[PDB]
């Protein structure tokens, strides 16, 4: 009942911001651009320093014309409208947003510990208690997002950042959507797509729980449950749904993953009468103190190295590119509400 009432208050908070979104709350000239932290299919994210406060932030830059070509206009409006409205300990905070003639800009808190992705590839795999610590945070974050009628749709290590205390921050709300019924857009990342997305069925928040199953498998194995050299091959494996587990996977871990990586929607954990509690009460999570995790009272498995305020040593290096702002406004109508 306490979770229920917590989520009720959170929804009140969310809806006020959802209906009256923050807009135009800084300007590009207020930030010193330092270094690129990462790129994705759509945007480039740079470390910046706010001149007036000396705070460091991570600034996502989207080229409006590219957003249009890739048919991501409504998605990008979703992304900013949702991210500015949410508030949870494992969701990256949006501090400012604004636009100019050429680009859209989302200025977030800078999460300095790097992508989960880079640590996972370098170390090889996480032990089960390590993976469980991260998994617990995703479970609570999805409980929160889904209670707001939000579907996230891009869970993967590349979109999960480690903070200074070793906790997860979820970034990249590019495919997040507020929807009460089914939805139909083919989006996500190939290794993480639920079968019903691949098969062009309408789908719902159960796809996020499937993706949690992929993430837990990849964390604990060091490779995804379905991989190949090309996406088409990956899709064939996903739809067959046959999963093989490393021999070091515990009995409890295999059982959880069989229930998350479940092609039958009437059987998939997260999607049953008991909702998220089928997951929270599973044997693999028996040692998890869900409230202590929410309160960030649990000692983390590891703490990223941190040499200073603006240090970027936990991120790969990227080729830097000039931020050019055209003297003519591009796509003004399309992004009027941003």
């Amino acid at each position: 009942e306490s979770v229920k009432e917590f989520l009720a208050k959170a929804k009140e908070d969310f809806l006020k911001k959802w209906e009256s979104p923050a807009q135009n709350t800084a300007h590009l000239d207020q930030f010193e651009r330092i270094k690129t932290l990462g790129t994705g299919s759509f945007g480039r994210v740079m470390l910046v320093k706010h001149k007036e406060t000396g705070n460091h932030y991570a600034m996502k830059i989207l080229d409006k014309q590219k957003v249009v070509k890739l048919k991501q206009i409504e998605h990008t409006l979703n992304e900013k409208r949702i991210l500015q409205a949410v508030n949870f300990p494992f969701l990256v905070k949006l501090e400012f947003s604004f636009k100019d003639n050429s680009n859209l800009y989302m200025v977030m808190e800078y999460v300095p510990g790097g992508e989960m992705f880079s640590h996972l590839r370098r170390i090889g795999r996480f032990s089960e208690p390590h993976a469980r610590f991260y998994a617990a945070q995703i479970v609570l974050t999805f409980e929160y997002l889904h209670s707001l009628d939000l579907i996230y749709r891009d869970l993967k290590p590349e979109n999960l950042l480690i903070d200074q205390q070793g906790y997860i921050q979820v970034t990249d709300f590019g495919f997040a959507k507020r929807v009460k019924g089914r939805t139909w857009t083919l989006c996500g990342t190939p290794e993480y797509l639920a079968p019903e997305i691949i098969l062009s069925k309408g789908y719902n928040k159960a796809v996020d729980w499937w993706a949690l199953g992929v993430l837990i498998y990849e964390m604990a194995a060091g490779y995804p449950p379905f991989f190949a050299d090309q996406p088409i091959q990956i899709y064939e494996k996903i739809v067959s749904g046959k999963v093989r587990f490393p021999s070091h996977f515990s009995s409890d871990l295999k059982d959880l993953l069989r229930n998350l990586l479940q092609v039958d929607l009437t059987k998939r954990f997260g999607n049953l009468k008991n909702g998220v509690n089928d997951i929270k009460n599973h044997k693999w999570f028996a040692t998890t103190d869900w409230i202590a995790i929410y309160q960030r009272k649990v000692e983390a498995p590891f703490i990223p190295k941190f040499k200073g305020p603006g240090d970027t040593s936990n991120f790969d290096d990227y080729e830097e590119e000039e931020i050019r702002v055209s003297i003519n406004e591009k796509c003004g109508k399309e992004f009027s509400e941003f």
Binding site: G40, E115, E158, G174, C187, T189
Partner: peptide
Amino acid sequence: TTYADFIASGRTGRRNAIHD
């Protein structure tokens, strides 16, 4: 080993989204 097959595959680097 499956690990060795993964490491020799073309998709061990950062994976971007799909669309359309």
